Design an enzyme around this catalytic site. Structure first.
Site, PDB file in Angstrom:
ATOM      1  N   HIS A   1      35.399  36.844  43.147  1.00 29.49           N
ATOM      2  CA  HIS A   1      36.725  37.288  43.560  1.00 29.49           C
ATOM      3  C   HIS A   1      36.704  38.650  44.251  1.00 29.49           C
ATOM      4  O   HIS A   1      37.718  39.043  44.839  1.00 29.49           O
ATOM      5  CB  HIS A   1      37.651  37.362  42.349  1.00 29.49           C
TER       6      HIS A   1
ATOM      7  N   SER B   1      44.090  38.175  46.422  1.00 26.65           N
ATOM      8  CA  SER B   1      44.490  37.652  45.102  1.00 26.65           C
ATOM      9  C   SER B   1      45.970  37.268  45.163  1.00 26.65           C
ATOM     10  O   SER B   1      46.405  36.627  46.136  1.00 26.65           O
ATOM     11  CB  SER B   1      44.112  38.693  44.054  1.00 26.65           C
TER      12      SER B   1
ATOM     13  N   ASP C   1      34.740  31.675  43.909  1.00 20.61           N
ATOM     14  CA  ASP C   1      35.900  32.431  43.435  1.00 20.61           C
ATOM     15  C   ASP C   1      36.831  31.538  42.616  1.00 20.61           C
ATOM     16  O   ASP C   1      37.234  30.463  43.068  1.00 20.61           O
ATOM     17  CB  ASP C   1      36.640  33.039  44.633  1.00 20.61           C
TER      18      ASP C   1
END
Ligand SMILES: Nc1ncnc2c1ncn2[C@@H]1O[C@H](COP(=O)(O)OP(=O)(O)O)[C@@H](O)[C@H]1O[C@@H]1O[C@H](COP(=O)(O)O)[C@@H](O)[C@H]1O
Lengths: 614, 519
Positions: free
Chosen positions: A313, A122, A186
């Site tokens: 994600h 991330s 994602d």
């Protein structure tokens, strides 16, 4: 295979993923030493302030890099610096801060010939990207060797830099060090393609949903996803229309009215589905794929996509754990991309545009091959050789030098030298015109043979172009050469060479220049010296003559600082081959004739007195 | 190997906020029955309502007197005409007198309208773009279901002035109104033809007309399709969520033919039906294939280099004339045309004229990029050429003429007018202190003007009338005399103008003697 392409094996990938998981628990970063490898994983954040810097008033949270701290992260000839997410940069700066142990740990691993890896999930992946560049500027460019090469491995990172950032990674040949894993749906790699204003309302909630901390909404997810993909659509359509040079007038008029995200993929991207692992080099092909791989093929899949986009994600665990069962390939190298893109959910139209982006790279490689062939042919190099080995010796034998010969004479060799000046202008202006429109590969401006060639061309022929400018009195039409007359081709050559010679020492040409001026210990104050030397010819030896033309017609106290500056630059110019001592001190030289007319006191104390007679 | 962009260009437009915001503004203006001017996200929209009452179909020439003029468009007698009802509605609604101040200080302006509202919006954007100065805001015009506005002459004039890309006309494929104007009307600007399945852009008036004919061979005619643009704008602007692959069978392998087939499908025709085949052929013959203008522009540097020795020949000839004892200056030398040096440099004059003619045609025909003439390199290469060579073209004209117009009287080569206009893409202060005569006379038409002043001095030699000799002197001689003397004063002539036996020195002498004669 994957390793062959990326210089990264599965063990390194798995350890990077563990470290990235590890970094949730630590603050800022977590260090994993293992064998020949030291891994620095970076903590993600999930508050809006860490994606869009609250004090950043621009529309995409973007900021230009600091030119002194990132001297390669720029276009060389054009000068434009790269741009990055300011929140990610600020996070990196807090980590770099000497009150943390980060710098010491990196230095130690460098001292031990360790293989350094930066990694992250991330926004920590984004932080990793910036950290790698920091490292490449601090360490690698200073002593490039194989033990010093970094690796950067991200998982679902958001985008970080703009096209200039990607291009500069390509020029320095640093792109090879970056791998970015993206699970098909994602959302985080797509988020920063949207205008801040499009996603402001719903971004806090969706970030909270992506934070692995207490999930407890479909409207907000679906609105957020819709808005990201709407802006992403605009970005992708415009980008592919632009890079192919289609409909230029329409696009330039529309562009004024649009705010489109500058963020671009940087490095290799690896897209992951249930059955494939697809690696892609080309930034723009990746951008198109970011849009088209997340489209819904029917109504059920539309119902599902936004939710799957948040949950994917966190599919990087299953990604790394299933790596060896997935079919791997490399899109850019594949000669039929239909099957790969079908498996990634890319429609026929999406495929047209991914193909367009790859094909545009192939055209750039073609243009470069054409240019290389023209500049390696001897009908070409022999014009430079003729000016070097016939024109200059004949003019200095005449006791006036080739500058002055071109400037006043009308013999057949001066006309010949004019013809050859015009032809070389053609070759180098064509190359420049291609670079201005992004028609050559990223690497071209860094190519050593091209730098050597253009530097020879600059040193040899820029004096003839200055001679040309002044002989036809264009300096009295459009002002001093160094202001509005100088061809951009010579500026590009000067910057390419300056970057080539200065980047291993971490120096900036402008700083080198001002430190030399300060060492001259002139009799003015700092701000006055800065005013006096504005747009002077003394920053570049191949501009010697332009400076002389500005000074020779003026009283000595008007120009004493500029004269002393020029004389101070001359000795290193002569040593480095920027200026030819067989030329400038000849009896007929404009410079020589002017200098003997400077007050006796200056000449007696000049570092050039043993070169000329009154 | 071509790349088909008609659907991509449509998709770019459709994906912008301008698409949906212009429509929203159109809808609000329709509901209000009044012009609406407002800002959305920093863009100013001027949305003109649909007007159902006015009588469309009757052409009239553009205004030649009044406050509402179009100097940027042709005067050349295939005369531009526009719909008279629309011109009248423009003056009726007081668009000029009002919009002028309501737009002062704005920086991004969209002018938009549904139906005759779109026809008025296009007229208004044209008016804004047809002044001697460009507007002080970017102008873009989006219409929805507009009837056609003017005749063929108007359309080709708009193309020639390079304004066509400022227009995007959205036309629903089942909207009869845009396809149904009387046959004297022609489209201009880019058309976005659209359906429930997507959009396709055509930027060429012939292709648009072809598409009009094709569509007029299709079927259902209900008037209220003209009223459904909100539905199409909504559907189109939401297609980004859905994956859209080819729905016929055989997507043709070849990349170019594939993009064409997808465009046909975006208009909603099947590549198997007769109508689909016609749409395919239309899209296929819209493009007209050339070498990539970006590459053409870059490699043109080598062609400028290859022709440059001719310019150098003019430079060498000019120097040699300066050094000649006859002291004619190279203008009068070349006009006399005695020597072999004159015949030699004439070859170079011709070579340069053909090169710059070729470059300017390439610009007109779009073989060079839309912004080619803004590059500093070409501005100054063309200026340097013109400075040296335009006197020789003037001299060749005056030496070949029947005695037979004047150069500046419809006899100046086009390329020099174009070069003149290119000079505005740069800076033009920077008056420098001149230490000597300029290398080349800065007014490149100076010698043509001198030849006219010579004829006028002779006709005032005929004279008789001692107060009409004054008119010729007060009106058509002394003005040129003081013009020349300021050019000499600021040193903006080259030295060859003040050569003892140049026609300028001769004329200056004749005139000073004549001026002693009569106070
Ligand atoms: N006053 C003037 N007249 C003619 N040419 C000029 C003048 N100033 C500058 N130039 C030339 O314009 C070109 C601009 O190209 P570039 O900098 O690449 O454009 P960009 O868009 O990047 O801003 C330059 O080539 C410049 O060249 C100087 O002027 C002389 C022109 O002579 P020829 O080559 O013989 O036409 C050159 O000698 C050079 O000094």
């Amino acid at each position: 295979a994957f390793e062959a392409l990326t210089g990264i094996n599965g063990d390194l990938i798995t350890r990077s993923w563990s470290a990235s998981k590890q970094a949730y628990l630590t603050e800022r970063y977590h260090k994993e030493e293992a064998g020949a490898v030291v891994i620095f994983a970076f903590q993600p954040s999930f508050s809006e302030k860490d994606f869009f810097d609250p004090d950043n008033k621009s529309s995409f949270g973007e900021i230009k890099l600091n030119r002194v701290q990132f001297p390669c992260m720029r276009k060389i000839g054009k000068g434009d610096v790269a741009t990055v997410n300011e929140a990610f940069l600020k996070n990196l700066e807090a980590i770099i801060d000497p009150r943390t142990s980060f710098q010491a740990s990196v230095e130690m691993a460098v001292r031990s010939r360790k293989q350094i890896v930066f990694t992250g999930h991330s926004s920590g992946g984004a932080t990793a990207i910036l950290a790698t560049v920091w490292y490449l500027e601090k360490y690698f460019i200073r002593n490039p060797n194989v033990y010093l090469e970094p690796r950067c491995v991200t998982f679902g990172a958001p985008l970080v830099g703009d096209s200039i950032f990607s291009h500069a990674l390509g020029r320095e040949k640093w792109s090879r060090f970056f791998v970015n894993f993206v699970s098909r749906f994602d959302i985080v790699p797509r988020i920063m393609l949207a205008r801040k204003a499009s996603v402001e309302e719903t971004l806090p909630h969706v970030l909270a949903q992506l934070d692995p901390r207490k999930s407890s909404s479909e409207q907000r997810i679906t609105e957020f996803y819709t808005r990201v993909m709407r802006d992403t659509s605009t970005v992708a359509n415009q980008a592919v229309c632009e890079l192919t040079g289609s409909a230029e007038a329409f696009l330039e008029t529309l562009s004024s009215f649009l705010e489109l995200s500058p963020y671009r993929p940087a490095g290799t991207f690896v897209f992951s589905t249930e059955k494939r692992l697809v690696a892609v080099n080309n930034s723009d092909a990746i951008l198109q794929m970011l849009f088209y791989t997340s489209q819904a093929s029917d109504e059920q899949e539309w119902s599902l996509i936004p939710f799957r986009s948040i949950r994917d994600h966190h599919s990087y665990e299953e990604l790394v754990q299933s790596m060896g069962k997935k079919l791997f390939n490399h899109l850019d190298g594949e000669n039929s991309i239909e099957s790969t893109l079908n498996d990634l959910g890319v429609s026929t139209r999406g495929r047209q545009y991914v193909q367009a982006a790859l094909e545009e790279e192939k055209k750039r490689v073609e243009n470069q091959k054409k240019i290389i062939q023209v500049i390696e042919q001897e009908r070409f190099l022999k014009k430079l050789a003729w000016i070097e080995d016939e024109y200059k010796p004949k003019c200095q034998a005449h006791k006036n030098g080739y500058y002055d010969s071109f400037k006043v004479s009308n013999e057949e060799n001066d006309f010949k030298a004019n013809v050859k000046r015009a032809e070389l202008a053609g070759v180098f202006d064509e190359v420049l015109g291609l670079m201005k429109k992004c028609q050559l590969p990223d690497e071209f401006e860094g190519d050593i043979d091209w730098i050597k060639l253009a530097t020879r061309y600059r040193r040899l022929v820029e004096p003839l172009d200055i001679a040309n400018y002044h002989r036809h009195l264009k300096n009295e039409d459009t002002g001093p050469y160094m202001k509005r007359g100088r061809p951009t081709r010579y500026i590009y050559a000067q910057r390419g060479y300056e970057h080539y010679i200065l980047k291993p020492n971490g120096m900036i040409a402008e700083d080198v220049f001002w430190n030399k001026v300060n060492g001259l210990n002139l009799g003015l104050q700092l701000e006055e010296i800065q005013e006096t030397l504005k747009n002077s010819g003394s920053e570049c030896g191949s501009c010697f003559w332009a400076e002389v033309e500005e000074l020779k017609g003026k009283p000595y106290e008007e120009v004493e600082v500029r004269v002393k500056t020029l004389e101070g630059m001359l000795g290193e110019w002569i040593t480095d081959g920027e200026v030819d001592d067989k030329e400038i001190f000849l009896e007929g030289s404009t410079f020589r004739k002017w200098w003997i007319t400077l007050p006796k006191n200056h000449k007696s104390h000049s570092p050039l007195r043993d070169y000329m007679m009154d | 190997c071509r790349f088909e962009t008609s659907e991509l260009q449509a998709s770019v437009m459709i994906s912008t906020p301008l698409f949906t915001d212009s429509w929203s503004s159109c809808n609000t203006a329709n509901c209000n029955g009044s012009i609406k001017i407002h800002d959305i996200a920093g863009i100013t929209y001027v949305a003109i309502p649909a007007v159902s009452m006015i009588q469309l179909g009757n052409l009239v020439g553009l205004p030649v007197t009044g406050d509402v003029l179009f100097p940027g468009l042709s005067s050349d007698e295939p005369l531009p005409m526009v719909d008279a009802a629309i011109l009248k509605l423009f003056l009726q609604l007081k668009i000029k007198e009002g919009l002028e101040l309501e737009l002062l200080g704005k920086k991004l302006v969209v002018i938009t309208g549904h139906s005759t509202g779109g026809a008025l919006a296009a007229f208004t954007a044209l008016w804004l773009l047809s002044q001697s100065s460009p507007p002080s805001f970017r102008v873009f015009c989006i219409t929805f279901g507009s009837p056609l506005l003017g005749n063929q002459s108007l359309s080709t004039s708009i193309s020639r002035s390079r304004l066509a890309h400022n227009f995007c006309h959205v036309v629903s494929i089942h909207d009869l109104v845009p396809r149904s104007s009387n046959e004297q009307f022609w489209p201009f600007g880019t058309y976005l033809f659209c359906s429930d399945k997507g959009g396709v852009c055509l930027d060429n008036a012939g292709s648009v007309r072809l598409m009009f004919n094709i569509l007029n061979t299709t079927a259902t005619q209900n008037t209220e399709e003209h009223q459904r643009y909100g539905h199409y704008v909504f559907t189109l602007s939401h297609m980004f969520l859905k994956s859209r692959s080819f729905l016929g069978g055989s997507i043709p392998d070849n990349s170019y033919q594939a993009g064409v087939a997808l465009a046909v499908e975006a208009l909603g025709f099947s590549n198997d039906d007769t109508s689909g085949v016609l749409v395919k052929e239309c899209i296929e013959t819209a493009t007209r294939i050339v070498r990539a203008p970006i590459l053409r522009s870059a490699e043109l540097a080598n062609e400028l280099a290859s022709v440059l020795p001719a310019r150098l020949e003019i430079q060498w000839y000019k120097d040699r004339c300066d050094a000649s004892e006859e002291q004619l200056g190279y203008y009068d030398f070349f006009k006399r045309y005695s020597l072999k040096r004159d015949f030699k440099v004439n070859m170079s004059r011709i070579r340069l004229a053909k090169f710059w003619d070729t470059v300017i045609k390439m610009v007109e025909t779009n073989e060079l990029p839309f912004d080619f003439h803004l590059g500093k390199k070409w501005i100054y290469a063309s200026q340097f050429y013109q400075l040296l060579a335009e006197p020789l073209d003037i001299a060749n004209f005056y030496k070949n003429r029947d005695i037979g117009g004047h150069y500046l009287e419809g006899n100046r080569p086009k390329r020099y007018e174009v070069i003149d206009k290119w000079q505005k893409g740069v800076k033009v202060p920077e008056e420098c202190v001149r230490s000597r005569y300029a290398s080349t006379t800065q007014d490149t038409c100076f010698w043509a003007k001198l030849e006219q002043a010579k004829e006028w001095l002779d006709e005032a030699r005929k004279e008789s009338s001692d107060p009409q000799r004054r008119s010729l002197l007060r009106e058509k001689i002394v003005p040129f005399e003081s013009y020349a003397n300021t050019l000499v004063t600021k040193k903006e002539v080259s030295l060859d103008v003040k050569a003892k036996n140049s026609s300028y020195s001769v004329w200056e002498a004749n005139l000073k003697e004549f001026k002693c004669k009569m106070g």
